[PDB]
Amino acid sequence: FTVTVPKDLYVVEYGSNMTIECKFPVEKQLDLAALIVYWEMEDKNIIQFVHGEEDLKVQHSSYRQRARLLKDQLSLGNAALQITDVKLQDAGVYRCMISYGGADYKRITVKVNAPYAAHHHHHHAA
Amino acid sequence: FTVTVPKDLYVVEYGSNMTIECKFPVEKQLDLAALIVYWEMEDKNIIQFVHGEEDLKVQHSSYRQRARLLKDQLSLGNAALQITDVKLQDAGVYRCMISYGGADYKRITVKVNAPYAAHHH
């Protein structure tokens, strides 16, 4: 069992939407019962998909109403995480962790470009 | 399904042995087939127990010949990582990741005290 990422680096513009992908083998048919998909960055719960259900109550505050798993692509062996309205704080190293029979995870680096004004707000906040 | 750690902080001396422990629930007899235990620090593979056996081929070089999983305790719900001859590079944040039915992981901070001579090298 192997998780793979088509690209391990994403360069995204502040304010845009981004979809970062992780691949896992599904032969030709998904067994939702045996699937757990978990997305985290730093150590914040972004997505927890178990029993074919998104589990939203533990979703971390910074990602609520902004992150979802594109479920339709699961049939293809694709756990794609979409995050809307990217912030500078979305920059960092994401991990996609998948249990499907076996277990594996992969790392994805996200870098965020932002104009002066946004960076400026980020400079005073932190 | 919940992984728990009795201690999330360990302070260990350079040159000693350390055992960091994390628990997972085992209701009935342990089902080795359905168990995966994975220990990593930063992003170095320390140990991988799958198919009821340790897989050393992905093991990070800095932990070779120094890390072992305490296998007898698995039946009790304890995936304990033992590291022998602790080095300064062993300091950091460890994650113990367990798939047993569900899946979960926990973080453990390890700090290493060392004398001048060791720190110098």
Ligand SMILES: O=C(O)[C@@H](CO)NCc1cc(Cl)c(OCc2cccc(-c3cccc(OCCCN4CCC(O)CC4)c3)c2F)cc1OCc1ccc2nonc2c1
């Ligand atoms: O219920 C709750 O609400 C509580 C719990 O009670 N949480 C819920 C919860 C549910 C799930 Cl489903 C979860 O998913 C873990 C998960 C999902 C899928 C595969 C694995 C896995 C496990 C073992 C081995 C493995 O493969 C090894 C990879 C080796 N590879 C890579 C390296 C090489 O290149 C090649 C080999 C993958 C794996 F663990 C994590 C969770 O916790 C959230 C959290 C964790 C730490 C924190 N710290 O701070 N806040 C934190 C918040």
